[PDB]
Design a protein around this nucleic acid. Sequence first.
RNA 1: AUUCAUAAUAACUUUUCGAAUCGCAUGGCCUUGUGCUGGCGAUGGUUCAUUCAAAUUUCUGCCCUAUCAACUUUCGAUGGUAGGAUAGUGGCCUACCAUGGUUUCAACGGGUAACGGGAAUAAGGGUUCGAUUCCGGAGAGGGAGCCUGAGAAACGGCUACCACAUCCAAGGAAGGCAGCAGGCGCGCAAAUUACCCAAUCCUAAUUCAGGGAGGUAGUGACAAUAAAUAACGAUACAGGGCCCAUUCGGGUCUUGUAAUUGGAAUGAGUACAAUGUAAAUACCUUAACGAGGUUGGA
RNA 2: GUAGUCAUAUGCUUGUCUCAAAGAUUAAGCCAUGCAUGUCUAAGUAUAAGCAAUUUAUACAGUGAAACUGCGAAUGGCUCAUUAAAUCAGUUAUCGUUUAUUUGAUAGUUCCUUUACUACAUGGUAUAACUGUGGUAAUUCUAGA
Lengths: 659, 259
Amino acid sequence: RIPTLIRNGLQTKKRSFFVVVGDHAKEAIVHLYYIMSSMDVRQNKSVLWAYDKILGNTYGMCILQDFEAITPNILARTIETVEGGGLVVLLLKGMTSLKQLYTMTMDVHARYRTEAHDDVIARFNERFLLSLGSCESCLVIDDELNVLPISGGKGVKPLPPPDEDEVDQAKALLTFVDAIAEKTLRNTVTLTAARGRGKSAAMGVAIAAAVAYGYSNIFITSPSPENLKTLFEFVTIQYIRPQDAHVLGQAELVVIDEAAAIPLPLVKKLMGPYLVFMASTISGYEGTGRSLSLKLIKQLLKEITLSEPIRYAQGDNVEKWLNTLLCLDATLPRSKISTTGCPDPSQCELLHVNRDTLFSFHPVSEKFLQQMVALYVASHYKNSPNDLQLMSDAPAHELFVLTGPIQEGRLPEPLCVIQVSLEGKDLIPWLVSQQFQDDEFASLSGARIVRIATNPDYMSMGYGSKALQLLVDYDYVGVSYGLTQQLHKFWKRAQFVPVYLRQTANDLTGEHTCVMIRPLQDGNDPSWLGAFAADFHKRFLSLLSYKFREFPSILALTTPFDHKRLESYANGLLDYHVVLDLMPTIAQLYFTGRLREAVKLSGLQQAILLALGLQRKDIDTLATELNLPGSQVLAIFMKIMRKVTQHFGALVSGAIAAE
Amino acid sequence: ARGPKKHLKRINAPKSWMLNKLGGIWATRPSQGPHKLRESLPLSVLLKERLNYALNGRDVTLILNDKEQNVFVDGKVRRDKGYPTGLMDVVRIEKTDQSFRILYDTKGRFVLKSLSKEEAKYKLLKVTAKAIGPNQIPYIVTHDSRTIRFPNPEIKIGDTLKYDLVNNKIENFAHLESGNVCYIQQGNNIGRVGIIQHIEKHQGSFDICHVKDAKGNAFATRLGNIFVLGQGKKSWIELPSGDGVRETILEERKRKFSY
RNA sequence: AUUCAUAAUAACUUUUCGAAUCGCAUGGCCUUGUGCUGGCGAUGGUUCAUUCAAAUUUCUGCCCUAUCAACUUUCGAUGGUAGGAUAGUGGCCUACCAUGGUUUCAACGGGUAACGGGAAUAAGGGUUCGAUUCCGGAGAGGGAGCCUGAGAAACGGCUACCACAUCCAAGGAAGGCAGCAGGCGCGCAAAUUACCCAAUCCUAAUUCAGGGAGGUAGUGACAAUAAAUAACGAUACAGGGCCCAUUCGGGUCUUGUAAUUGGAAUGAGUACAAUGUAAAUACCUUAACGAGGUUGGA
RNA sequence: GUAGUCAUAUGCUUGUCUCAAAGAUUAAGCCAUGCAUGUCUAAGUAUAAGCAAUUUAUACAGUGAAACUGCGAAUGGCUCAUUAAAUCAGUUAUCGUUUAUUUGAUAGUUCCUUUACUACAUGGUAUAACUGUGGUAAUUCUAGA
């Protein structure tokens, strides 16, 4: 049966999607047991069960348990890991019931929706059914199917034999790479490709290929790590991360893995001192949008691309499936495939559309939303299906599009898009209460502008603001972005008010993330905005010093509350920086506190509170002095805060701790 | 050794059981009771090989486990595959009202004597030790591991009592002294019955005794092996194999085939 | 034999003791509820000896060796002693000291891979036994410590340590069958990973638990034995014989039927129950039912 | 000399009958594969038809699930490897030592509070087992009810 078919698959170097749809116990569990025994690419298979750590390894056969919930990113990542002949068994609920399935049963994975209870996500199911149904490639086994026909397999059955599967890199390694010429030999190369293309392996070759003594010595850097393992394993590779990397200049050829992830400022400086190989993943989950990639490239570039996967043969139906399901395809930035495409000429028109557009397939259909998705996704530094699922099923998702000429069914492409995500009642609706003063902040509703993007050909038209206005047009609106003097004014010009400036530079952008709100209702939202804004005002000195970068908080622009915050750190989980900065409530408290503010009290981890807050001593340093095991430091800081408050006012603190 | 033995080997089980050499490999090991291992006859032996009432091993298992109670030892019920019935005991087979004496041959094999409802009443007890215990009270003890309370005072340590089982009463005792009748419980001379001649004590740790009988044979054995079967010539119980007296291999022949 | 008991005896002992049993037997007693009536056991405790033991323990005895002469004493070589351990005897130790004493009957001592050795007849003889060690100490990777407990120097309890030494989603998470068989090996050397616990023995709790006991086989000249497996007879026909040492003489005379008779010869299957692996019990023992085909010399 | 060898020597290979032997022997080469000391009622614990299997004890029938139990699982069995030693033999009772096993026996002085002794129409607990909630690459796992 399928075991014969499995033999064909590994020979072809392809993988297939096996869908088990039915009762949880019936089709799903028992069949999985049977399949494990039966399907033996090798004896059986590894059959890793998924219901990030996994990538370096590969496995024969795996199971994805969507019965309750479907996390698409996980599905895509899992596929990339599977070896040749492997089967990805997708466990689904009863097929008839699946679309509606999700409600009480719900898509548990609804961590995209994040309503109190999980919901249906019909649209996603519909898209899924479309791709699945389209061709014969995926095997659908439904319960109540006494016998399932298996196209392909032993005997004559459907599956046209691919050639036995078993040059692109070689053409690339030294070869395109021999950078010597009238033009400079030293320059920057940028190889980009989808996952599993061999970018790393390609990057590894150059390491030895250049020999310490001989061709030359190399170097390597990367963002939050990324699998450094393949490149070096394929590799003198040594690794100092970019920031630490900023130290001294030894090497002839630098290689940076997925540089798009690294801050423009840091990246640019580094590229100047040497010759580099720039690698970046695109067209997949956790890849980088090609729209952004161009802007990034422009900053320079000799760019090259690799088309074929090392792990499987091209045309692998499993991979095609995920790409289509996930909407991996990039085409809109260069051009649309139609008479129109590429720049979007004409007068830009602002309009809104609902999620419902998702089901209908006619004018305003899957296509319109799909096009919007491609544009926003394309413009982001990182791409993720969570975004896609949210767009499809999540409630509280609203879109506005800026489109070029519209007339007949087919017209030119969209110039811009705005995606609003209601939030309230992640990012603007999780933190305002953890980071802000009102415990209640989480209760209201607002729409975060998760993503806004204007086609690069069209930018600086005012379409961006036009998009926002349309959003407001017919408690508040919010946005969180990496702070830039430039971006802030855009939002300020938008009518946003600066809410918060956090502590940690965006790992990717390198700028600190700020939050702003555009007050829609006066009842409490302008109140929360103003109150936070005022709080930030008090905090301003604290933040600037704390920043290290010590950037002053302009924000979009040219106490009893403290007691509550303080109690929250002392009595509860609120983090140190939230209370702390140079002097938010925490430093404020140290100034007042007679206690050990100094060697022990104040506000922070070290002298427990003071040495970190005042001194800026390291966590490790005070752990030794204080003789704490680590983690315990925070506990001590909290305890120190509690002590100071009690000294100040015993009765007040007791009540606060209580409620 | 590991701890305490717990089995018994065909080959190693006493010649007194007239056992089946080819038999098996083991043999019911006597349970810790009134009589010592060697000097005893476990019931299973008593019915299977002896009486022959039982047969196969399970045969016993029935008899002693059956809710009817078919075996009595000294007026009491017993249900142990290997209760050590010892010398001078009285065993009754309920379902047939059979009464037996547990006595050794003249050739030293355990023999079963049939008693009349009369003797079945009295049983002969030999005195183990004699001393006074708790709250000024006198105690006597019999080989049969009997512990006696307030016993007649004219009883020396090496005595022999007649016991009325029915009333758990004593009557007519008789010490061992020049001029009595005796049975020898064990030795190169067991199963014999004669007249005590004299008892020479040597204290160094072992006193001896002499004896005469029917054909007036001279017998020699250690006191510990003398059991007073009676006072002044009259024996107190019917003996197996006629009178307690063995014959030369020569006398046996002349008596049987008359050579 | 006693400072023995078993007495007391006081004291003073984180110290006990002492059936909140269950089982049927609840019908007799008086009351009439009653009070019992507990019967009888099950289920206890008590200490003693009651075997259970061990555990000592004198008193005879391993191979040779004087070319062993001398030995043994710092804490034991001894005595003797304080204690302490020891569960409880002990130099066993704490001490504390006794100098002891062993010894040519060779002691000190040496040397013998040393694990290690019950029955009875019997003029005479006949014979034979227990059964490949009755007997009977020391191993269950190394080490350690520990374990159970009536009751272990606990092999087959631990640990932990070491070591080996293993599974793995990374993470953790194994594992020491000279109680068996098995393949390697070893490599001298030997039968299926039979049947049953049929006994008779085992354990064992109130029965009929369980018995890797045992048994049963097979295999199996194993050592093997046995030593018993086509002949008895009908007729004709007859060439003359056929043998010798033979050289020729002699001997004399059946011999062939590839002729015609003999019993319902006998073998082998069939109930046949079965001493019978209560099943091997159809394979025995039957019983029968049936049922004969080396040499030399052309 | 003699042949034989009643020498083997192994060297050739054939009805019916069995008291019936076979990796201690080398290294005291070990755990492939196969495998493995638990247990019962007169008797101690089971649901007023969620052990529950009947069936009608019926205020506790059986009936057992499971547990509790409570037991053995210090037994052997293979192993000299040692060991020249009492090992062992006899040959010692042990006034010198411990003792289940088994019986036999068996035990009025427990307050006395300065008897609401409460009043024993025999206490308290505690727990499983048990229903469940679980976890984890995964335990003789284990979590929490």
